[PDB]
Every structure is written in C-alpha cells, then in structure tokens.
C-alpha cells in the first residue's frame, strides 16, 4: 500500500488517523499519526528519557539539546521528513515488502481471559412469541467473538479508546544523533509472542563517511529490520554477543563486542565472518527461537485458524506473519537494501565508527536536500551545510 500523505501537525484529532495516546502506563501523553496500517509516527522527542542529563552521563560523540523538537514547526518538519523517508522506502519493491511485513507482523495476542485459544462460549438471543411457545427457537452467537487480547495497541488519554499499533516512530531521546529501537515489553519480546516496537530517529542530521553522506532512509531501514526481532518475539538473551573488534589501542587485552541482532541487521563485511555456510558459531538461542516460533505457528494452525469467532483483521495478518521463516529474518540485513536502493553505506566495522574517525554532522532539509529519489545530486554531490551543532559534540 501507500503511506498516508494528508497529515499535518495541526491536523484535527479524528480518532482514526490522528490520536492522542498515553505513553505506556505513565501520566505522560503524546500525539501520534497513522501513516500505514498499524504504523504510527509521533513527531516529538521520546518520552522515556530525560532531555537534560548529567555531564558525567553524556556519551562521547553525542549532541544534547532539551529544546529540540519542542516547537510545532519542528514537529511538522519531523513528521513530513518521516513521511518522505517512508515514501522513499515504500517506492521500491523490497522496501514496500518490508513495510508490508511490518504492518502484518502483529505481536501474538493473548487468548481468552480464562486462558485458552480454542473456542468461545456461545449464547442464545431472540424468540418467536407463540399454540407453539417458540422459546428455544432463537439465534445462537459465539459469546466473546474477539476474546483474544492484543498486546499491540495505544490507549487514549481517557483509557476508553484503543488503536492498533506495531511501530511508533518517535524523535530522538536525550542524544539527538542516536537512533534507537526499543521494545514495549521485554517478556513478550523474548517469548515468541512479540511486542510493539518504538523507534527513535533523527532525520535532520547525517555524517560524511569517506566522501559520501549517510542516507537517512537506510538508517530508518536498519531500525525497521531490528523491529522484526521484537515483532516476532525472537529477541535473543542479552548475553548473546559476538566479538567485534580487538581493542589494540589499550595496553591490556580487551575485546569490544556486539549484540547478535546489531551484527545481523547492520550488515557490511563483518557479519559474513559469523554467518557461514557451515555454521561455526551456534547458541541455544537459534534452536530455542525456532522452537518457540514453531510453537506459535502451531497455535495458529490448530486453534486460531479453525475459529470463525475471529475477525479477519487478526487471523489473516497472523497467516501472512507465519508465511515467513525465522531464517528469513536472520538472513535479512542492510546489504540487501544497499543493493536494492543503490545506497552507499560503511562496510567495515559500521557499528564502531566512533573510534576510527570523528563524525561531523550535516543538516538535511526536506524536500530541497532530500526527495523521494534520495539525496538531490546523489550521496556524493549533495549540497549539504554543516550543522550548527558540531560545536556541541561531547568529547570524551
């Protein structure tokens, strides 16, 4: 499908595409816009992180601004930038398939309140008056008809309205040059059920690496690919990490390490040393996640399928969700989209760039500096201005 276009920061709240919903269970509330089915954009800073932190807690290479994305003009620019990036992603067959998969990869809903996925309880309604006394002549309907309790939804401020949601694209947190991908519920993120995924994204700043600027669309795509692990509930144990770079600068032997998801998503040359045709690196996670994915697939195939007290909006999406295999998610990375979109990206140690060279940030404007066709005049000859925030970078 195509991303919704008729959205503005001042667009009225209609409870269909423009909603004002609570952030998790806190007393904080934010405005969200539906761009695609089960896909939302919240053009504000991320609520979960304090926008002003200690000087000791500021990370190296980061930029901190508590007043960024506070005005409504900045919010509208952010919303339009995210819409443009999503349109560019959806303008290619591969990116369109990725967005459709995200839209259909709803987290597995919990069963009936009493526990179970099998069947409703039924109930009788109606009567024909009379001679005959037509008391048992009546209609029979399944009682709940929707008892499955979905975990992917944003709750309105009054806590009386609920809107389906798989992906919410927020602004940056404390650090405005740090994109991130976080999960709604860790338990649901690791048990195969899946959970809603939130994204912190910065579309206004890029950095020049070896004569070309990083395309924000492919950064968003990295976040979207990482969201598949959370949507499918196949987030590994936090301890599953691989050695990424030997810290030869230090006097003693020390290894930098990386989470397996970041390695398998970021792409480049590094993951080819871990993903081999004969596997040389294995863990309980791969077999266990395959097992739990098969378990949820069986739950659908045996119980959810043969249950016509469900709307198609849930079971058809589950059907399309289980059309994919786990190995498909594992093999999916950024190199595929680099080829499909013809987008240049760092290829060696792309997650350790903060060590090898000092990033300088350039301001991206939409649609003058970036259109649906990517950067105007490409990633090489783009006319970008050095951002005013290069002086605010933390040097530790």
């Amino acid at each position: 499908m195509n991303i919704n276009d008729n959205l503005s920061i001042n667009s009225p709240v209609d409870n269909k595409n423009v909603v004002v919903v609570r952030a998790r269970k806190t007393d904080t509330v934010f405005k969200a816009f539906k761009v695609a089915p089960n896909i939302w954009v919240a053009p504000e800073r991320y609520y979960g992180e304090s926008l002003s932190i200690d000087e000791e807690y500021k990370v190296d290479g980061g930029i901190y601004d508590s007043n960024f994305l506070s005005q409504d003009s900045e919010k509208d620019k952010f919303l339009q930038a995210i819409i443009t990036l999503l349109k560019r992603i959806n303008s290619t067959n591969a990116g369109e398939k990725l967005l459709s998969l995200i839209s259909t990869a709803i987290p597995f809903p919990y069963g009936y309140i009493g526990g179970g996925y099998y069947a409703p309880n039924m109930i009788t309604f109606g009567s024909a008056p009379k001679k005959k006394l037509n008391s048992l002549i009546s209609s029979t309907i399944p009682f709940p008809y929707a008892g499955y309790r979905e975990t992917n939804y944003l709750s309105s401020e009054d806590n009386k309205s609920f809107y389906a949601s798989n992906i919410v694209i927020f602004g940056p947190g404390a650090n405005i040059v740090e994109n991130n991908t976080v999960f709604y519920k860790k338990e649901d993120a690791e048990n195969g059920m899946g959970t809603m995924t939130e994204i912190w994204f910065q579309p206004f700043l890029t950095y020049k690496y070896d004569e070309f600027y990083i395309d924000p669309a492919i950064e968003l795509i990295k976040c979207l690919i990482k969201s598949l692990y959370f949507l499918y509930g196949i987030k590994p144990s936090d301890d599953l990490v691989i050695p990424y770079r030997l810290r030869s600068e230090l006097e003693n032997i020390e290894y930098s390490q990386l989470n397996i998801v970041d390695l398998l998503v970021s792409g480049g040359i590094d993951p080819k040393f871990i993903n081999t045709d004969p596997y040389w690196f294995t863990d309980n996670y791969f077999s266990n996640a395959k097992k739990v994915f098969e378990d949820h697939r069986n739950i659908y195939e045996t119980e959810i399928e043969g249950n016509n007290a469900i709307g198609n909006d849930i079971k058809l999406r589950l059907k399309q969700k289980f059309r994919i295999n786990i190995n498909d998610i594992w093999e999916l990375n950024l190199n595929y989209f680099s080829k499909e979109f013809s987008i240049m990206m760092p290829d060696r140690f792309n997650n350790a760039l903060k060590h090898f060279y000092r990033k300088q940030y350039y301001k991206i404007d939409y649609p003058e500096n970036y259109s649906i066709n990517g950067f105007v005049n490409g990633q090489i000859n783009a006319q970008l201005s050095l951002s005013d925030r290069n002086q605010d970078i933390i040097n530790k």
Partner: protein, 421 residues
C-alpha cells in the same frame, strides 16, 4: 407558507425522529425471502460494536463534527457516537398460504443543530446517530413480474419512524458562564464583573425561596433572558448551595433579544431548580448590576413574562411597537404611561390591538393605595387581533397590558397604541 418558529436567539438541538435510511438501498442490511410456513430472523448481534454515524453541515469551521457531537452531549447527554452494544433482531413468520419478503435496513436518528437568529436559521448541521434498524415486510413478488428501469435518486434520507420533533436549547460555548454558588435571597444585587468585557454571558444561580421574582438591570437596560436547567436538582444536593450538574440543556422561559429594549422579567423560580440568565452584548463600557427581588405584591400577576417599558408615548396619534413574539400560551407585557398631565379627571381614548397574532389581553392600572404598589384589574379577555373596541384611560397614568399569545401567525408581535383626544 412558512411555519413560524417562536424560538429565541441561540443554539438548539432538535431530535427530528428515528428510523432514517438512505436512498438507493445504501443502508440495506438485506432481504429474506421466507417460504410459506417458515420463519426468518435477521440479527445485529454487535459482535463488533463499531457503527458509522453520518454528518452534514452548512459550515464546517463553526458547526464541525466535534462541535456538533459536543452540542449533542449537551442536549441529550449522548456519549457513544462510534460504538454501540445495543442489539436488534427482526423475526417474521410467513403465513401458511403465501411467502413473505422482509427487508432490513440500518437506521439513523436525525439530530439537527441550528443557530436560530431573528426568526431564521443562519447555520444548520445534521448528525445522523446510528439507530436500531428498520424492517419492512411485503408480499412475495409474483415471479417474475416485470422490471422497470430507473435512474438512481439524489443523495438523501427517508424517515420510516414516527413523527418527532424534540427541541432542546443548549448553552453557547463561546459565552462565559458565571455561577452564584450560594442560593438567592429574596433581594440580591449581582455586580457584573469586568472580566466579561461587555460580552454576552450567562449567570447560573439557584433560588432560596420558591416564588415570583422581578429580575432586571440598571434602568431596565439591557433586556435579559432566563432559562431553566432541564432536569436540574434531581441529584446531588447541599442545603443553600448551588449543586451544579453540568447541565447545559436549557428551557427558554422569557426574555427579549433586543439589547436596546427596556424590559424587566417577572418569572416564577423554584428553590430546587437551577436557572441561567443571559445578558446580551452591550455596546458600552457600562457597569451593570442584575437586580433580583422576590415579589410579594400584585406584580405576581405578570408571571411569566417580560414587561416592555414604552418611553416615546409622549404624543397623541398612532404608535406601534414590534417585539419578538412569544410562543402559543406564553406571555408578553407592556408598561406604558398615557401622555398628558395626571389630575384623575383628564382622560384620552386609547385603542389597543395587534396586527397579525391573536392574543388574550388583561389590562391592569397602576395606582398607589394604602398598601403601595398595586395593580387593579380593569380589562379582561380583550381580543387584540384587529380589536375594534376602545377605552378611555386617565392621562398621566401608568398601565400594564399582559398579552397571552393564542395564535402564532408571525415571528414578531406588533402591539399598537392609538390615542385620540
């Protein structure tokens, strides 16, 4: 041939009946062909609560969907627009001789939000609230009959339910409301605050003593209007204090809209009910006070009505005064002074009549007696519509005419004073 609406200036929500369907079978749930001896059931079991309300407006920037929904919430306290858990099922048993068709349509309830001003609707919105269905039964069409080609009809609505028109005035949300938390004693003076800078506004108040009150402004300017909060005081209550139930549904009692008309209100108030008083936009920076006074004398005969003060009756000849006519069986009063010096013997010939509206008038005379303010009933059952009878009244004397509208034939009522001699 336009019917007269005697409503006062303001915002109204009208329930215009149930059982509304769209043309061209847009709302057709479907048709059941029931064989002889069989039964047919069509159920809306609300397995999904979602409903599809409809909305049209004459202006979307003022009477928007949000605004219309809020006005509906004010009028009838409706709170579910998109959802509904209410089921409805239709059962039809075909008789043993012939077959029966049943056609089931989704229905709507037609609420109409109007902005009534000077006897003409200046803004109007239609909200169709999802209702509980319509079912029509018909004889089975004989196979095969014959088909007649037809063009699709224009987009519209057809009512299949009973005739219904429930008009409920609502509080204008652009006008601030001031609340008098403590009850009204027999005499009170409300100082109009400076915050409401000569903008029209409401005063919400309760009364301590059930009785007839004269309410006015300084020099009876501007005219005031009074409403009753519908269904107020059937709930939470504290003695002597105004327990406000957020009731924006208002019932018009009396009052003039023309802010240049001298008038004072004589209205019966209950100590259990809550009342709104609207004071219109004043074109001046004038500090004003709302005077409430419980009436014990003969002025109790003027309830419920606005009394219109006539000033320019300072010469002989023909005069006439046009004011917003009340509904049928409602009242309007006129207090006027006969021209000339008063010596209790000089008299002039007076003729009272109306031009279009028929009404029954009672004429009181103002005299000071041992008791004080005192009304003497001097004329009863005067039929004002083109009345031909005249009476001699004392020059320099004050008279109060109370007119009860018996036939509504125009939005305005025109009362004439014809003075000979």
């Amino acid at each position: 041939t336009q019917r007269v609406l005697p409503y006062s200036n303001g915002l109204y929500v009208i329930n215009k009946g149930d059982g509304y369907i769209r043309t061209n079978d847009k709302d057709l749930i479907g048709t059941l062909l029931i064989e002889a001896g069989s039964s047919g059931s069509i159920i809306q079991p609300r397995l999904r609560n979602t409903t599809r309300p409809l909305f049209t407006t004459s202006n979307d920037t003022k009477f928007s969907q949000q605004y219309t929904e809020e006005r509906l919430k004010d009028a009838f306290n409706v709170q579910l627009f998109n959802t509904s858990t209410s089921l409805f099922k239709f059962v039809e048993e075909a008789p043993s001789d012939k077959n029966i068709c049943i056609k089931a349509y989704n229905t709507y309830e037609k609420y109409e939000l109007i902005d009534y001003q000077n006897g003409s609707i200046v803004n109007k919105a239609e909200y169709y609230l999802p209702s509980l269905g319509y079912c029509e039964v018909t004889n089975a069409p004989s196979p095969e009959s014959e088909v007649v080609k037809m063009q699709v009809a224009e987009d519209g609505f057809i009512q299949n339910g009973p005739e219904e028109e429930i008009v409920v005035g609502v509080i204008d949300p652009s006008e601030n409301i001031q609340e008098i938390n403590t009850a009204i004693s027999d005499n009170y003076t409300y100082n109009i605050p400076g915050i409401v800078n000569n903008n029209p506004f409401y005063i919400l108040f309760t009364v301590n003593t059930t009785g007839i009150y004269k309410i006015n402004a300084q020099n009876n300017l501007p005219s005031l209007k009074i409403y009753e909060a519908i269904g107020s005081g059937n709930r939470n209550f504290q003695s002597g204090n105004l327990c406000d139930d957020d009731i924006k549904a208002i019932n018009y009692i009396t009052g003039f809209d023309s802010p240049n008309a001298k008038s004072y209100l004589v209205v019966l108030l209950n100590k259990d009910k809550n009342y709104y008083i609207r004071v219109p936009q004043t074109s001046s920076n004038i500090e004003n006070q709302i005077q409430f006074k419980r009436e014990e004398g003969d002025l109790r005969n003027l309830m419920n009505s606005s009394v219109n003060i006539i000033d320019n009756l300072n010469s002989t000849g023909a005069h006439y005064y046009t004011r917003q006519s009340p509904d049928v069986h409602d009242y309007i009063s006129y207090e006027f002074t006969i021209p000339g010096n008063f010596n209790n013997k000089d008299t002039s010939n007076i003729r009272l009549y109306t031009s279009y509206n028929q009404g029954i008038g009672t004429l009181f005379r103002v005299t000071e007696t041992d008791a004080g303010y005192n009304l003497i009933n001097i004329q009863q059952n005067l039929h004002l519509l083109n009345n031909t009878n005249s009476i001699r009244l004392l020059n320099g004397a004050i008279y109060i005419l109370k007119v009860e509208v018996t036939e509504l034939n125009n939005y305005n009522i025109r009362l004439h004073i014809d003075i000979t001699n």
